[PDB]
Amino acid sequence: ILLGVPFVYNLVWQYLYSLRKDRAPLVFYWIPWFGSAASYGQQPYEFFESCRQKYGDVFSFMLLGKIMTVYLGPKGHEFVFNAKLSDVSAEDAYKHLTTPVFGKGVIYDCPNSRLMEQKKFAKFALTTDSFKRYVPKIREEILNYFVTDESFKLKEKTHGVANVMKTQPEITIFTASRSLFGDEMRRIFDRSFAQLYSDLDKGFTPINFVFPNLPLPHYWRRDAAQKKISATYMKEIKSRRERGDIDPNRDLIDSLLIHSTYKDGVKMTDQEIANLLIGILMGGQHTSASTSAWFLLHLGEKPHLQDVIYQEVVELLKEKGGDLNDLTYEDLQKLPSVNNTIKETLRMHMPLHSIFRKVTNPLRIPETNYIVPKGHYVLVSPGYAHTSERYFDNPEDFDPTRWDTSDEVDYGFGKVSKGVSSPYLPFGGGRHRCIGEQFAYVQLGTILTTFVYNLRWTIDGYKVPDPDYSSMVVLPTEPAEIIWEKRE
Ligand SMILES: CC[C@@H](C)n1ncn(-c2ccc(N3CCN(c4ccc(OC[C@H]5CO[C@](Cn6cncn6)(c6ccc(Cl)cc6Cl)O5)cc4)CC3)cc2)c1=O
Ligand code: HEM
Questions:
Q1: Do 306 and 456 meet the contact criterion of CB atoms below 8 Å apart?
Q2: Ligand 1 centroid from CA 470, angstroms
Q3: Angstrom distance (rounded) from CA 374 to CA 367
Q4: Which has the least CB within 10 A, 31, 120, 299, 399?
Q5: Other C-beta atoms within 10 Å of 228: how many?
Q6: Separation of alpha carbons 170 and 193, rounded Å
Q7: How many domains does the chain fold into?
């Protein structure tokens, strides 16, 4: 009867909290501590609506013992994405997840001042010039999946059925490796190095937000996975240092080697660079492999859209008389089917759905008397707004064409926007703004252009998969496959 005992107190307390006209409204739930982890972790945009139809734009909900004050729409964007440091912490929300996976010292295992420069150091491999050297590497890597991978084998076969839960994560990590990390880190993925990243993934799971370490196999296998992979990168670092092979514009390992001394002259360690390398590779590999998976599916549901984005690239190549191997970075900038498709795929399917900070001193919510106390979490969600009749009409319609017809601030890593209020914020905003956006459109952009150029495909049933949210990012439920045929 320690069933009534918690029930009666958590129940009676749930009503207690109703009183305070200074605390945002809270969603009801029957389980103590567990809260709405059910309804939210399964379909959270419905859940958001199922709360806005009741409470408007501002509200809260329990989540595995932790409070999550929400704020929808461009006003929520300003409230969380642009909070300054003395009220919200982005590390105190993302720490227990990313750190055990990437390693100490970097990303969220350091103060914000540190993180700001790591994002600056990174950006030295993310320039207009880098992207020109990456396009053909990324492309040729793709084509090498098309010819050597059992899902395609385009030099033997002419029709097939490729799983996008396999093709895209492998193509994504292979193209990221080959371009960001260079040829030896890519050649070393022949080995089931991949198995080590599989071991690292299975411990990069939302459950880390509460259970980041406990004595289980995939926990210790993740710990060991991070140790083996950093030391691999720590080995590439040492081997190109002592070789004198540090080329300040080529890879991201280079660029990180050069620039990795802080404002106060303090020096990132060899492992700290390796960990940050791990985070970068893993973060970008998830969010990019997802987006290419979806725009592969959606183009298979509306195969007309492969033909738009196809004819666009042959008009450019016919002006160059130069085949696909002569399709450059600046040519990506002139193919708006590709970019709007990616832009649309990111509207319909932003990879992160919730975005947290934790509250570090009481924070007054604007035009309310609600104050978030030290202890609760804030949650923006550019995703809700990405698929609301409020901000886009026919959010259901995968419409790449819909994309036709404030100055700046620099927190540390180059100039970003001061404006956060756009309904469309796939890459976030503020000091935690993403730095791989333009890079992602070079990847997704070459994946996409290469696929369409060689492959025409459909998806059987014209049923686009339902989305899953068990995981760190949002992915199609399998069987998520594509029925393809060589174009020639
Ligand atoms: C398991 C039981 C089941 C019933 N259930 N019950 C509840 N839930 C649930 C709850 C919460 C969540 N999540 C979803 C994921 N979410 C989340 C994911 C990523 C994230 O990322 C923010 C930061 C840290 O990681 C990166 C991701 N990234 C950004 N750009 C590219 N990747 C990041 C930033 C920088 C670097 Cl270097 C790497 C990375 Cl990974 O940004 C924040 C929140 C938290 C809530 C999912 C399911 C369930 O599945
Ligand atoms: C389509 C692909 C991507 C999407 C949709 C995406 C999304 C996001 C979002 C929403 C944030 C803000 C998180 C917050 O404010 O809480 C963010 C930040 C970030 N992203 Fe991306 N990202 C993508 C690609 C990448 C890639 C390829 C990389 C690395 C090469 C990367 C690295 C980062 C980093 C380092 C941050 C900084 C977070 C911080 O400063 O705290 N992202 N991203």
A1: yes
A2: 10
A3: 20
A4: 31
A5: 13
A6: 12
A7: 1
**Strands of 481-486's sheet in order across:** 159-163, 481-486, 455-458
Rg of the chain in Å (alpha carbons): 23
Q: Region of 88 please: left (phi>0), alpha (psi -120 to 50) or beta.
A: beta
Residue 222 CB burial class (10 angstroms; 0-12, 13-18, ≥19): buried
Phi and psi at residue 61, to the nearest 5°: -175, 140
Q: Which amino acid is at 323?
A: D
> How does 355-371 read in b/e, with b if 16+ C-beta sit within 10 Å?
bbbbbeeebebeeeebe
**Residues pairing with 355 in the sheet:** 380
Instruction: Indicate whether residue 445 lines ligand 2 (CB < 6 A).
Output: no
The Cα 309–Cα 330 span in angstroms is 16
- CA 42 to chain CA centroid, Å, is 19
**Which residue lies with its CA nearest to atom 43 of ligand 2?**
434
286 known ligand binder? no
Cα 378 from chain centroid?
19
User: What are the distances in angstroms from CA 128 to CA 132, 332, 473?
Assistant: 7, 12, 28
Cis peptide upstream of residue 373 (ω within 30 degrees of 0): no
User: How many angstroms separate the Cα of 412 from the Cα of each of 119, 263, 427?
Assistant: 8, 10, 17
Where the chain is broken, by preceding residue (C–N > 2.5 Å)? 405
3 state SS of 402: helix
Q: How far apart are CA 340 and CA 405, in angstroms?
A: 12
How far is the C-alpha of 168 from the C-alpha of 286, rounded, in Å? 10
Alpha-carbon distance of 186 to 386, in angstroms, equals 35
Pocket test for ligand 1, best of 48, 106, 352 (most atoms within 8 A of CB): 352
Rounded Cα distance between 427 and 204, Å, is 20
Does 94 appear as a known binding residue?
yes
Most informative mutation of 469, 471, 473, 474 for ligand 1 (most atoms within 8 A of CB): 469
DSSP strand pairing (455-458 vs 415-417): unpaired
Q: Are 292 and 448 in contact (CB under 8 A)?
A: yes
Query: How far apart are the C-alpha atoms of 347 and 383, rounded to whole Å?
Result: 7
Q: Does the CA dihedral 122-127-130-135 come out positive or negative?
A: positive
Assigned token pair, 151: 């899902």
What residues does ligand 1 touch, defined as CB less than 6 Å away?
37, 41, 94, 98, 107, 206-207, 279-280, 282-284, 287, 352, 354-356, 434, 469-470, 472
CATH number at residue 226: 1.10.630.10
Centroid of ligand 1 to alpha carbon of 355 (angstroms): 8
- Resolution for this experimental structure (Å): 2.9
- Which tokens go with 160? 């097939």
